[PDB]
Amino acid sequence: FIEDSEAVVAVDAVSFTLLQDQLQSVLDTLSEREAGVVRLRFGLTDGQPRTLDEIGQVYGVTRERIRQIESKTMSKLRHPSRSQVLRDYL
Amino acid sequence: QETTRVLTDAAINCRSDKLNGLKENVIIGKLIPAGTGINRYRNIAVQPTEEARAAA
């Protein structure tokens, strides 16, 4: 009787798989530029979180431009129609 | 039974098991060579018949 509290949850694995699928879907619902900016901002493509200067460099624009992009995209995402399919994942 | 002696003398002889029995395929979790495990039945090729395939 030594329960393995740190172990496979056996449900959160598939839960996170479906989570990631849903996030890729939602990001495809939005503009491609917005989706790529969010992916680089939050490290969804390689696990390396890119910051405003790096993303502004790779898009050839300024960090305040991308901050405006990020704010508008996150405001778009807070709109429930884009969030009804994600609310239950917490 | 007599586990220590059996293991040691097997080790000296380098006696290689062939896993041809049943309890061994139970121990290593592979399909047992009885019932639906023997190759006469475990390697059945199943295909829809050509006539009904065309009819489909």
Binding site: - | K23, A34, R40
Partner: protein, 333 residues
Amino acid sequence: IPRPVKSSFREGLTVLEYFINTHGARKGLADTALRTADSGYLTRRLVDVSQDVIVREHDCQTERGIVVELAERAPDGTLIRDPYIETSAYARTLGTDAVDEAGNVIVERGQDLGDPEIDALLAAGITQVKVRSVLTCATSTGVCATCYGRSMATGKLVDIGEAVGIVAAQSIGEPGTQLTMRTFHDITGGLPRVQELFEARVPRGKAPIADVTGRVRLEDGERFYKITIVPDDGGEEVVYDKISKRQRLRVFKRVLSDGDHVEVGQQLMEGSADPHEVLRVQGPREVQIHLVREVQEVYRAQGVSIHDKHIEVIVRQMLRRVTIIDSGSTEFL
């Protein structure tokens, strides 16, 4: 207890009578528990013994096989059915055919030998048929199908993947528990007897057997007996040295009288003898017959139906290896 109890449970027992009944009640219950442990253990051992008997081939295509008693003859003359046929004959395949009085064939080679066909044989008036068994199946690794006969579960011919060894294991070791031994005390018969017989442990109550035919040289020595066999060729007289008077002489057909002609391996006293000795005398055939008859004797005594083919699988597993008395010149100690 020589009192004995003299009140029915309707009448209600008295204090002492009830106190006496308690002895047997508790004894029986404790024996039940211990014997359950023992029977589970026996099944455990047997399963490993017979783990590698699995039907591989459809037909080994041999011609050897055992004969079955199958309704021995009546003195006045009829076909009185042998009571234990369902366990010894049914679900078997014939290697030979049934012919009688130079007549026509009755049942051909390789038939399931069910109720209608046995009825036909008994109507035609034959007593012995030579039938296949798993003892003489000539396949290398495990029995063929036709040797194992009808699968007792399906009612059809056994399949070509069945683990008949473990099936026989469970069938033999399952009906333990309800296996109370003989009521008699030095007499030995019960689950211990079954266990010793399979274990091949020389039965503690060895009953000396014969070694060659001829009449008997019987004598009652000092406080115990002295028997000897008069050979027929002859040769050296096997003189049985000490034969305690705590035994009995074998009664058959009459009691064993002096000068009576004995068989090659006739049991002299009444009891049991070592399967080793009956082997070295009368060969693999006699030992297999002896083992099956003995074990089935106990299971019959408790009125339990077990087809003999399971026991036959187990004894076939028993009689595999041979012993090296001369190395020849190759690799055998």
